[PDB]
Design a protein that fits this description.
This is part of a larger assembly, with 2 copies of chain A, 2 copies of chain B, 2 copies of chain C and 1 copy of chain D. By secondary structure, chain B is low in regular secondary structure. Chain B is built from 1 helix and 1 strand; from the N terminus they run E-H. Chain C has one domain (1-296). Chain C has helices spanning 39-42, 59-63, 101-108, and strands spanning 3-4, 67-76, 90-94, 110-127, 142-148, 170-174, 180-184, 193-194, 219-224, 233-251. The chains are: A mainly beta, B little secondary structure, C mainly beta, D mainly beta. The interface between D and F is large, with 81 and 76 residues. Chains A, E: It comes from Human enterovirus D68 (EV68).
C-alpha cells in the first residue's frame, strides 16, 4: 500500500513499486507566497505546469570508493527548460521542490544511501583558511562530490545529519526515496543566481557490494519545482 | 519590571512550553500506528 | 501535533503481549521516521508518575546566557610616536558571534535565529610595566561606546569630531560603574538571522561566500574620553552578548572539528582522535572491548 | 526634488540639474541613465528623499521619477523610460531596456511624465553598506531612450532640456537612524571661540 | 477626452496625448480559449504579465520615397523575451494583440499613414509564377517593406484595404494609432513558427512633406500580446 | 487631510487598463504639486499587506537624541601668573546649537522649532604633563554650573561672589558622579524658536544679521568649586543637549556645503566635488555611464 | 515615571502618528483626481 507511489506534476509522471513512504520536510507542503507575507509589489508570474514538472538530471555511478554526491537548489535547475528561462528573465524567485532519487539493483546486492536535504548547506574548505570560491560552490546541473562525507564537508558530523529531512535507500528494502521541500529562506523571495536554499546530498554510508556479475548501478535524481513564482521581469541575464 | 518604552527591552520570555517533535521525528505524509508493520 | 509539555511523560504499566501481526519493536528506518517503539511495548513496565521538569532545555533558557563575544586590549597613553596599526586610545570592532567558540557552536546548532541582543561592556585597567615600573594607582576613566551601522563612517582618532554622535547611539560609562548594559533590537532586514548562508551576497562573482552583511549587527567604536595621562596604562574591554526573545529554526548537526576561521566553516581536525578528520570519537581496542568495564 | 542627472565635469552649477536632448539621425538611441542607490553618492543623493534617507541605514518602498519637458510648444517627441531590476548590466539598447518596467512618454499639453520604480526586493528592507554591488543594496537601473525622435521646426531651439525629480511614495519607510555622511567638520567653526568670550 | 489614452499591460505603460480613439478589430476583445472550443487536452500555461506586455520593435525611418512597412504576427515577436521563450518551448500558441504605432512631427509637417491589420495576408510575387519563398515571408523582428503598396503586394487594391481593421495617422490630427486584435484563425490554436495570423502594414498614402529644417521622423511599433496561452511543452526548437 | 499613519500603505492588485481619456502617468509639475501616480496605475501589482512601521521617522524620535553642543578644556591650577585670555579655573559659554555640525544640520532641516532642552554635563580630568611629569592620581572635584540669562552678569573669577546664586539656577556635581542632568524649558519669548532669521534684531542698522537673541537659551558658567591643588590638571567639560516635546514647522532644504561660521550661513564649498560650490554631487564620465555597473 | 512638579520635565512624547503630507505635496486650491488630466 505504502510501497507503491505515483507522482504526477505537469506532463511528467513517475511510478515506483519499492518506495518507503515519503518525507515532507518539517511536516510542511509547498505553497504560494501569501499577501500578508509578500514584499515585492509587482504582479508575479506563475507558469504552473510549464515549470512545476519533473526534470531529470544526469545519472551518477555508484562505485565501491564513492564518497557521495550533492546538488544545490535552485542552482542545479537554473538552466533547464522554462524554469531556467523564468529564472534567467526574473530578478526574484520563490518555489519549493519535490525530489525523487532512484537506484535499483538485484536481490544479491547490498548498500545504503542516505538521501538528505540540507537547508543552507554552507560548505567549508579542508586544511586552509581561504573560503571556498564561486566555482567550488556553483556546479550547476552536474553537481559536486563530497570531499569528506564523514564531516559533511562543513566540520559537522554525518551521524547527526538525520536532524535534516532525509530518507534512506536500502537495497534490500527500497529502490527510491522521495522528499517534499517547502520554501526555506529568511526572506520571502531571493535572487536565484547567488543563493541556494537547499542542498540534496546522497551519501553511501554502506558501500555497494555483491558477489554476482558486476553491473553498473546508477543513481538518478528527478527534481520537480513546486508553486513557482517569479518577480522582477527584465532582460535575460544568463 | 520594564519601564522602557520599547517592547524589545524587556527581559527574556521563558514561558513557551509548546512543542512539536513530530515535525523532526515523523515527517511522513502517512502516520504510523503502534505495533502495526510500518513497511 | 503541537502540544504543551511541562514535564516528562509518565509511564503506564504493561502486561504480557503475544499478539500475532503486531510487532512494535520492528521499524523501517528507510522512511526517515524515528522509531516509535514505546517502553511499554518493549518490556513489562510499572506505573510511574513523572514530575521532572523540562524548562531548562527551553531554547530561550538554552541561549539566553551572556557569553563573551569580544575582548580587546589597548594602550591608554601618548600616541604621537605610535605605529599606524596600534589602537591609539580607541578601537573599532565589527560585531560578530564567531570569534569565541562556546557561543558560536551553540548558535550554529540552528539554521535560523531571531533575537534581540543584550550587550554588556566590562572595562579593566592595569598600569603598564614598561616605562612606569612603579604602581601609582588605577584611574577612574570615562569610556564612550558608539554604535555605528555596518559600513558607515567610523572615527579615525580619539578626538575625532565623529564622536559627537548626532544620531548614532552612544553610551558613556565609568570604570568604577557597573558594566554598561544596552539592548540592541533584532535589526536584520529579513525575518530572521541566517546562521549559515549557502550563497554570495554580491551581484558579481568576487563576493564573499557564507558572509551575509544583513546578518551583521553593526560596529562598536570604543574610546577613552579622558585625554592621556603622563603615564601609560593598559585598558581591556570585554563585550558580552545575551540573546533574548529567541526564535529558532532548523536545528543542525553540532560542530565536531575545531574551528579554523571566523569567516567560514573551514575544518582541519585534531592530529589524532578525538575530533580528528578521520576519527571523531576516541578509539578502543575492538568492538568487543568495554572501555570502562567493572571488574571485581 | 530635482535630480542631479547631469553630474559631469562639463556641467557647472545649475547646468547639472537639467538634461539636454537634441535631434538624432539614428533610431533607438540611448539618452541617459540614472543609478539606483539613495544611500550612495549620485543623482539621487542631493534630494529631499535622499538626504533624509541617508540619516538612516534601512529603507523600503516604491519611488517615483517625474520628468518635465522644458522645450518649446512646437517641439514634439516620444521617449521611453525604463526601470531594470538588478542582476545584470545596465541595458545599452532599447530592445533590452523595454523588457523591464517602462513607460512611453509622449510630449504634449501635459509636460510631465511619471515612471514608478516599484519596490521589487527579496527582503523586506534594503540596507546601506559601502558595497554598491551587494544583493541587499542594489535596486536596478533607470534608462531613457528615444521612442521616435525629437522633432522641432526651424525657428525653435534644436536642443531641449528635461528636468528630473524623484520622490518616495506613502509605502516608503526608514530604519536604523545614523549620523549623516553628508556633513562633517575637521576643526572648530569660525566665531565658535567667541561664545566662550 | 478621447485624444489622450494610457495603455497599461504587465510592467509596461504607454501614454499618448494625440490619439484618435482606438480600433477593436471587428468589435471584438481578446480572450482565453473556452472549454467548449478547446481541442488540446493538456493543461495550458498562461504566463500573464510575463508575456502580456508591450514589446517595442526597431523604429523605421519615414522617407519621401518610402513605400511602406509590414510585420507579421506572431513571427515578429517569436524571439523576444518570455513570449519568445514560451513560443520556442511550446508546440501550440494562442493569443491576441494590442498594436500601438507612434509617429510625431511638427505642426509644419504633413503626411498620412494607413495603419492596417490584415488577417492572413498571403503575399504574392511580382512578374513570376514562382511562389514567395520562406525567407521572403519570414522576416522576424525587422519585418519587410512593400514592393507595390498600390496593390498590397497581393494583386488586390490598397484603396479597398479599409475593409480590414485600421486607423490613420494624419500628422495634422494625431501622432499615434492603436488597434486591438482578437485571435483570428480557423483553428483554436496554431503552430507559431509556420503560420502568421496577422500582418501589421503601415503605408504612407500621403508622402511626408514640410518646408522646415529636415529632421528624422521615425515610426515606432509596440506590440503587446494578450491572453497568451501555450500548449505542448517540450524542448526548445529555436 | 490629517490622518493617523502608523504603518506604510498597503498595495492593491491591479488589472489591465485601456481607458480613453485617463492618463494617470501624465502630470503637471508647473502647478507645484507632487505627482500622484500610484503604482497600481503605472504597472500591474499584487496585493501586499504592509506592516512596516513609521515610528522611527517621527520628528520627536528624529530630534530627541542627545548631541554634543559644547566642549571646553581648561587648566585647574594656580592662576596668579596666567594670562587674561586663559580660563582661570572657570569658563562661561553662550549656549548655542551651531558649533557642532551634526546637530546643527538636523535642526536647520526646519524653519521653526519649539522644544524643551535636556542638558547633560560630562566632566573628565587628566594630569597636566608639563611641570608634573609624573602621575599621582585623579582628584574627585566638585563643579558648579550656573545658568545665567543672556546678557546678565556672569562671574569674573573662580571665587567671585556672583557664584552665591541667590536666584540663578545652579547645579553642583562631582566628577565621580554620573553626568549631571537638568531640563531647561522652552524659554523663547515667541511661540517657537527661529532657526533662521531673515532680519536684524536691532532698531538701528548696525545690528547682527540672522542673530535673534530671543532664540538664545542663555549662558552656562562652569567653575571648579575646589580651590587649586599644588599640581595642575586639565579639566574637559562636555555639554550635550537633547530636544524633547518638539514641534517643527516649514522643513527646509538640507545644508550641502560645509559650514564656515556659527554666526551666519556663509558658504565656500569644498575645492572639488562632492559638496563643491559648482558641483554638489561627484562627477561621472557622462550621463550614459553607470558608476557601479554590474559586469559578469 | 515623572515625579517632578513641572510638566516640561517629563520624558519625550513619541506617540503622535498624525500626518498631513498633502500640505507639502498638494498645496493647490483645486484638488486633482486620479487619472484625469490635471492640466
Amino acid at each position: 500500500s505504502d510501497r507503491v507511489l505515483q507522482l504526477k506534476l505537469g506532463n511528467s509522471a513517475i511510478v515506483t513499486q519499492e518506495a518507503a513512504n515519503y518525507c515532507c520536510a518539517y511536516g510542511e507542503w509547498p505553497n504560494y507566497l501569501p499577501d500578508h507575507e509578500a514584499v515585492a509589489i509587482d504582479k508575479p508570474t506563475q507558469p504552473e505546469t510549464a515549470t512545476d514538472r519533473f526534470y531529470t538530471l544526469k545519472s551518477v555511478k555508484w562505485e565501491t570508493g564513492s564518497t557521495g554526491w550533492w546538488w544545490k537548489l535552485p542552482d542545479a535547475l537554473n538552466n533547464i527548460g522554462m524554469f531556467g528561462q523564468n529564472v534567467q528573465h526574473h530578478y526574484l524567485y520563490r518555489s519549493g521542490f519535490l525530489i525523487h532519487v532512484q537506484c535499483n539493483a538485484t536481490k544479491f546486492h547490498q548498500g545504503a544511501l542516505l538521501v538528505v536535504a540540507i537547508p543552507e548547506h554552507q560548505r567549508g574548505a579542508h586544511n586552509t583558511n581561504t573560503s571556498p570560491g564561486f566555482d567550488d560552490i556553483m556546479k550547476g546541473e552536474e553537481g559536486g562530490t563530497f570531499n569528506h562525507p564523514y564531516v559533511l564537508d562543513d566540520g559537522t558530523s554525518l551521524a547527526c545529519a538525520t536532524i535534516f529531512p532525509h530518507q534512506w535507500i536500502n537495497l534490500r528494502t527500497n529502490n527510491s526515496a522521495t522528499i517534499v521541500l517547502p520554501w526555506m529562506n529568511a526572506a520571502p523571495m531571493d535572487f536565484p543566481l547567488r543563493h541556494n536554499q537547499w542542498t540534496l546530498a546522497i551519501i553511501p554510508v554502506v558501500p555497494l557490494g555483491t558477489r554476482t556479475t558486476s553491473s553498473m548501478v546508477p543513481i538518478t535524481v528527478s527534481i520537480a519545482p513546486m508553486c513557482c513564482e517569479f518577480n522582477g521581469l527584465r532582460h535575460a541575464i544568463t | 519590571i520594564n519601564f522602557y518604552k520599547d517592547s524589545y527591552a524587556a527581559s527574556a520570555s521563558k514561558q513557551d512550553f509548546s512543542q512539536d517533535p513530530s515535525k523532526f521525528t515523523e515527517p511522513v505524509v502517512e502516520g504510523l500506528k503502534a505495533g502495526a508493520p510500518v513497511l | 501535533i503541537e502540544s504543551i509539555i511541562k514535564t516528562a511523560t509518565d509511564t503506564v504499566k504493561s502486561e504480557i503481549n503475544a499478539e500475532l501481526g503486531v510487532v512494535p519493536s520492528l521499524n523501517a528506518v528507510e522512511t526517515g521516521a524515528t522509531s516509535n517503539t514505546e517502553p511499554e511495548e518493549a518490556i513489562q513496565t510499572r506505573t510511574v508518575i513523572n514530575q521532572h521538569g523540562v524548562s531548562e532545555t527551553l531554547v530561550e533558557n538554552f541561549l539566553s546566557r551572556a557569553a563573551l563575544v569580544s575582548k580587546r586590549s589597548f594602550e591608554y597613553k601618548d600616541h604621537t610616536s605610535s605605529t599606524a596599526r596600534a589602537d591609539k586610545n580607541f578601537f573599532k570592532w565589527t560585531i560578530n558571534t564567531r570569534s569565541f567558540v562556546q557561543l558560536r557552536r551553540k548558535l550554529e546548532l540552528f539554521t535560523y535565529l531571531r533575537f534581540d541582543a543584550e550587550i554588556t561592556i566590562l572595562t579593566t585597567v592595569a598600569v603598564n610595566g614598561s616605562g612606569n615600573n612603579t604602581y601609582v594607582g588605577l584611574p577612574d576613566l570615562t569610556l564612550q561606546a558608539m554604535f555605528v551601522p555596518t559600513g558607515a563612517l567610523t572615527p579615525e582618532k580619539q578626538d575625532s569630531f565623529h564622536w559627537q554622535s548626532g544620531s548614532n547611539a552612544s553610551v558613556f560609562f565609568k570604570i568604577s560603574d557597573p558594566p554598561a548594559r544596552i539592548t540592541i533590537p533584532f535589526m536584520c532586514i529579513n525575518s530572521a538571522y541566517s546562521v549559515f548562508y549557502d550563497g554570495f551576497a554580491g551581484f558579481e562573482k568576487n563576493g564573499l561566500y557564507g558572509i551575509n552583511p544583513a546578518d551583521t549587527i553593526g560596529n562598536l567604536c570604543v574610546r577613552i574620553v579622558n585625554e592621556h595621562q603622563p603615564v601609560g596604562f593598559t585598558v581591556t574591554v570585554r563585550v558580552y552578548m545575551k540573546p533574548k526573545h529567541i526564535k529558532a529554526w532548523a536545528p543542525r548537526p553540532p560542530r565536531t572539528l575545531p574551528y579554523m576561521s571566523i569567516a567560514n566553516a573551514n575544518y582541519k581536525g585534531k592530529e589524532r582522535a578525538p575530533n580528528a578528520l578521520s576519527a571523531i570519537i576516541g578509539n578502543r581496542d575492538s568492538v568487543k572491548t568495554m572501555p570502562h568495564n567493572i571488574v571485581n | 526634488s530635482m535630480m542631479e542627472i547631469n553630474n559631469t565635469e562639463s556641467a557647472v552649477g545649475m547646468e547639472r540639474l537639467k538634461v539636454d536632448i537634441s535631434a538624432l539621425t539614428d533610431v533607438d538611441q540611448l539618452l541617459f541613465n540614472i543609478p539606483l542607490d539613495i544611500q550612495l553618492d549620485g543623482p539621487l543623493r542631493n534630494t529631499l528623499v535622499g538626504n533624509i534617507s541617508r540619516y538612516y541605514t534601512h529603507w523600503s518602498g516604491s519611488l517615483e521619477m517625474t520628468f518635465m519637458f522644458c522645450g518649446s510648444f512646437m517641439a514634439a517627441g516620444k521617449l521611453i523610460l525604463c526601470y531594470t531590476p538588478p542582476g545584470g548590466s545596465c541595458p545599452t539598447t532599447r530592445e533590452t531596456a523595454m523588457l523591464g518596467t517602462h513607460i512611453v512618454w509622449d510630449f504634449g499639453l501635459q509636460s510631465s511624465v511619471t515612471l514608478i520604480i516599484p519596490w521589487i526586493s527579496g527582503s523586506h528592507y534594503r540596507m546601506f553598506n559601502n558595497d554598491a554591488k551587494s544583493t541587499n543594496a542594489n535596486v536596478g537601473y533607470v534608462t531613457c531612450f528615444m521612442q521616435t525622435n525629437l522633432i522641432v521646426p526651424s525657428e525653435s531651439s534644436d536642443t531641449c532640456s528635461l528636468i528630473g525629480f524623484i520622490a518616495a511614495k506613502d509605502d516608503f519607510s526608514l530604519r536604523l537612524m545614523r549620523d549623516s555622511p553628508d556633513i562633517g567638520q575637521l576643526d572648530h567653526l569660525h566665531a565658535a571661540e567667541a561664545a566662550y568670550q
